[PDB]
C-alpha cells in the first residue's frame, strides 16, 4: 500500500515544530509580548498550535476593527484571495545542482555542517531568533515561473544576483508563515526609496502615505505573522485598511483598473504598498523551480558566497587570480584558496602590495582576527611570506605571532612557532 | 491518532524499525528529495525509533 | 589673529581603532571601522601629517602609548592630533579589555606635565558610539551615534568621520577649524532625518588654520 | 551658511543676577544691538524656572535669535533647557539659543554655552569690550576665542557649540 504520505506529511510537521520551537523559546520580542514557550530541546505540536492561534488573532483583530466593507471592497478580497503566488529567493551561491534545489537556513548551514556563505546583520539572534527559516520574497504576478520576474530588489537590498523562483503548490509551504514587512525591519519603504519609481511617480499622493507606517503598534517593534491559511486574506484586509485612509486617484482608477489584468497592475501595487516575506522551515527541497539569471556575478560575491562553478568562469587570467586570492585571504575561505592554488601557479612578486581596495598588508591580512590557518600555513610553505618580519603601517613593531597570541588562536600560534622560529 | 500508530505496519517491534528502509521507502514511492529525507531521519534522532515512543510528541 | 602653524613639519597624528572587542567585556564587536581608519589615514596624511595607526589596543596599551608620545620632542612640529575610534559612554572610552578614563589620557598633555607643546593645539576627535577637563588649547570634537538608518552594508563607516573627511578635503584650505566643524555638524542631522547630534567643546585661544 | 537675522526683532535678551556693574554694562552693550533686555534680580530658584517656562511659550516667530545671560553664584540647568528643546517652542526652531553663563552638558541640536570662572568681572567686561570693538567684522566663535585669549592672558572659558551654521550681528 502506498501509505507513505501518512508518514511524509507527519515528519514535515515534526521538522517544522523544531523550527518554531527556537522562535517561540528564544527572542526578546515574544517574551515581552507574552507569546513565548520554554526551552526543551525537542519541541512538539504546541509550536504549531501557537502559530495557528497567533495567525487567528492577528487576522481577527484587523477584521473586527475594519468596517463591514461593501459590495466594492469585498470583491477585492476575491481578486486577491483567489490568486497565484510565486516566491523569489535571489541568492548568489551555487544552488541549482542540475535538477534539484535544496536551500537551507542559517541554523542548519551552521549546525556543525559549515557550508560557506551567509548574510545577516547583527540583531536577529536576540530579538526574534528566527534564524532557522529560509526567507522568501513574494510575487503576486500570477503567471508562470519560466518568465523572468519583474521584481529585482527586496525592501532596500538586492541580496543575490540569481533568482530562484518556486511555485506556491509545493508541500513544504504548508507551515510557512508570512509577514507584510521584514520581520526585524518592520518598515514599509517610503514612496521615494521604493523600486519601480515610474509607477510611484505616476501617483504622487500615494508615496506620501506608503512611507514608514509600522504594524501592530501595541509594542512598536511587532509585525503580525500569518500562517498558510490566513496569509491570503490578511493582505487584502490590510490593503482595504490602507485604502480607506487614502485620498488619491490611485484609490479608484488603478486599484480597480487592475481587476482584468492581475499582473503588472496587481504586483506593482502590492509590492509598493507592502514588502511581504515568506518564512519556510529548515529546508526547501524541490524538483521544480526556475533559476533565472538577473545580474552577472562579481568576484566579491563569488568568493564570499563560495561558488566554484561561477568562480572558474569569472576568473580569466592571473591578474584576476591574484585579486581572487586577496579576496579569499581576508575572509578565511579555504576552499577558494585551494581551488586557486590547484588551478594557478603564483610567485612572491605579486603578493608584495595590497591591490587597490584592500586596507592591510599581507603579513597583517594573514594574521588578523578572521584569518584562516590553512591559508597561513600554505603561504608559509610556498615561502611567499616571512614568518619573522614586523608590521610597518599598522601596529608597527609587532609581528604575526603577537597577533596570534592576542586573539588566542592556539591552532595558529602552534602553526607559527612550528613553521618558523619567532 | 490511531492512524499515526498503525500506518507503521512495517514495524521493527519497538526498535530502530529499519532506518535504512525508512530512508529508501520515502525516496521510492512518493518522489521526495534525499536532502529532505536525510533531514527527516536526522530529526528522528537516534536508533530505537519506537512507533509509540517516537510520537509521544503532542 | 591666526596661529602661525608654519613650523618645519606640521604636527603629529595618532589614530587608535578598536574593532574586535575582547569577550571579557560583553560587547560583541564594531562593524566596518577599518574603512573609517583608512579614510582618516588618507585624509590626514593629505594634510602633511604623520599618522600612526594602532588597531585593537588595551587600556594598559593605550595609556603607555599616550605617555610615550608625551615625552617626545614636538619642538619642530606645530600641533598634535589624536583620534579615538572605540565604544563608550558619555565620558568614558573603552579598550578591548576595559574602560579607561578620558581624563587620564590628556593628563600627559596638560602643559604642566609637558613643555614641548606650550600653547599648542591638541585636537581630540572621539567617535565613541561628558565630564571633560579644561586647559589651554584643547579642542574636543565628540560624537556618539551609529547613524540614522541603512545599517545594511555599513556603507563607509559612520556619518561623522566621513563628513569630517569630506569637509577637510575641500574647505580645509580656505576656512578655519570651527567653521569646518560647524559645517560637519550641519551635514550631520541633515542627512540624518527620519536622534543624536555631536557637540564641539573648544578652549582654543586663537584661530586654527591648516595652511 | 549664516543664520538669518533679518526677522522683525533680533531676539530677546534676559539677564539674571542671582545673588552689578557687569550686568549694568551688559544692559547697554546688548541694547545697542537692538534687543529687548529684561533685567532681573535675586530670586528663589523655582520661580526663575517657571519664568523661562513662560518665555518659552511666546510668539518668537518674529524674533531672529534668543539670548539668556545668567550671572549666578543650587538649581539644575536641565530644568531650564527642558522648556527650550525646540520641539515645543516651534517659534525658535532653527534659530540660535545663546546661554551665556558665569558661576555636565545637555546635548541638543541648536544650543551654545559660555561657561566661565567665578573668580566688574573680567569675563563679562572682556565680552562687552570685544562685542563693542568687533561686532560688524567677525562672527561669534572668533569673538569668543579672542575673549578666551584675553581672559587667559590678563581657568579658560569653555565653548560648547552645537550650532549648525554661522552667527553674525549685522
Ligand atoms: N533569501 C533571501 O535572500 C531573501 C529574499 C527575500 C527576502 N528575504 C530573504
JSON list of C-alpha atoms in Angstrom, two decimals, chain A residues 3-4 7 10-11 14 18 42-45 100 111 282-283, chain B residues 3 7-8 22 30 33 35-36 39-40 42-43 54-55 57:
[
{"chain": "A", "resi": 3, "resn": "UNK", "atom": "CA", "xyz": [0.55, 4.99, 2.52]},
{"chain": "A", "resi": 4, "resn": "UNK", "atom": "CA", "xyz": [3.91, 6.79, 2.69]},
{"chain": "A", "resi": 7, "resn": "UNK", "atom": "CA", "xyz": [4.49, 9.47, 7.31]},
{"chain": "A", "resi": 10, "resn": "UNK", "atom": "CA", "xyz": [3.73, 13.89, 9.60]},
{"chain": "A", "resi": 11, "resn": "UNK", "atom": "CA", "xyz": [7.52, 14.14, 9.51]},
{"chain": "A", "resi": 14, "resn": "UNK", "atom": "CA", "xyz": [7.80, 17.13, 13.06]},
{"chain": "A", "resi": 18, "resn": "UNK", "atom": "CA", "xyz": [11.55, 22.06, 15.82]},
{"chain": "A", "resi": 42, "resn": "UNK", "atom": "CA", "xyz": [12.82, 18.67, 21.21]},
{"chain": "A", "resi": 43, "resn": "UNK", "atom": "CA", "xyz": [9.54, 20.59, 20.95]},
{"chain": "A", "resi": 44, "resn": "UNK", "atom": "CA", "xyz": [6.11, 19.38, 19.85]},
{"chain": "A", "resi": 45, "resn": "UNK", "atom": "CA", "xyz": [2.91, 20.35, 18.04]},
{"chain": "A", "resi": 100, "resn": "UNK", "atom": "CA", "xyz": [17.43, 19.60, -7.58]},
{"chain": "A", "resi": 111, "resn": "UNK", "atom": "CA", "xyz": [24.86, 23.21, 12.73]},
{"chain": "A", "resi": 282, "resn": "UNK", "atom": "CA", "xyz": [14.56, 24.28, 7.95]},
{"chain": "A", "resi": 283, "resn": "UNK", "atom": "CA", "xyz": [14.93, 23.12, 4.35]},
{"chain": "B", "resi": 3, "resn": "UNK", "atom": "CA", "xyz": [-3.60, 6.20, 12.32]},
{"chain": "B", "resi": 7, "resn": "UNK", "atom": "CA", "xyz": [0.39, 3.30, 9.45]},
{"chain": "B", "resi": 8, "resn": "UNK", "atom": "CA", "xyz": [3.73, 1.95, 10.71]},
{"chain": "B", "resi": 22, "resn": "UNK", "atom": "CA", "xyz": [12.74, 4.36, 6.11]},
{"chain": "B", "resi": 30, "resn": "UNK", "atom": "CA", "xyz": [6.25, 9.30, -3.09]},
{"chain": "B", "resi": 33, "resn": "UNK", "atom": "CA", "xyz": [14.30, 14.56, -2.35]},
{"chain": "B", "resi": 35, "resn": "UNK", "atom": "CA", "xyz": [18.19, 16.32, 1.10]},
{"chain": "B", "resi": 36, "resn": "UNK", "atom": "CA", "xyz": [14.76, 16.24, 2.78]},
{"chain": "B", "resi": 39, "resn": "UNK", "atom": "CA", "xyz": [16.79, 15.70, 7.38]},
{"chain": "B", "resi": 40, "resn": "UNK", "atom": "CA", "xyz": [13.69, 13.79, 8.47]},
{"chain": "B", "resi": 42, "resn": "UNK", "atom": "CA", "xyz": [18.14, 13.14, 11.43]},
{"chain": "B", "resi": 43, "resn": "UNK", "atom": "CA", "xyz": [15.13, 14.65, 13.20]},
{"chain": "B", "resi": 54, "resn": "UNK", "atom": "CA", "xyz": [8.85, 8.48, 18.96]},
{"chain": "B", "resi": 55, "resn": "UNK", "atom": "CA", "xyz": [5.36, 10.01, 18.79]},
{"chain": "B", "resi": 57, "resn": "UNK", "atom": "CA", "xyz": [5.04, 14.13, 20.58]}
]
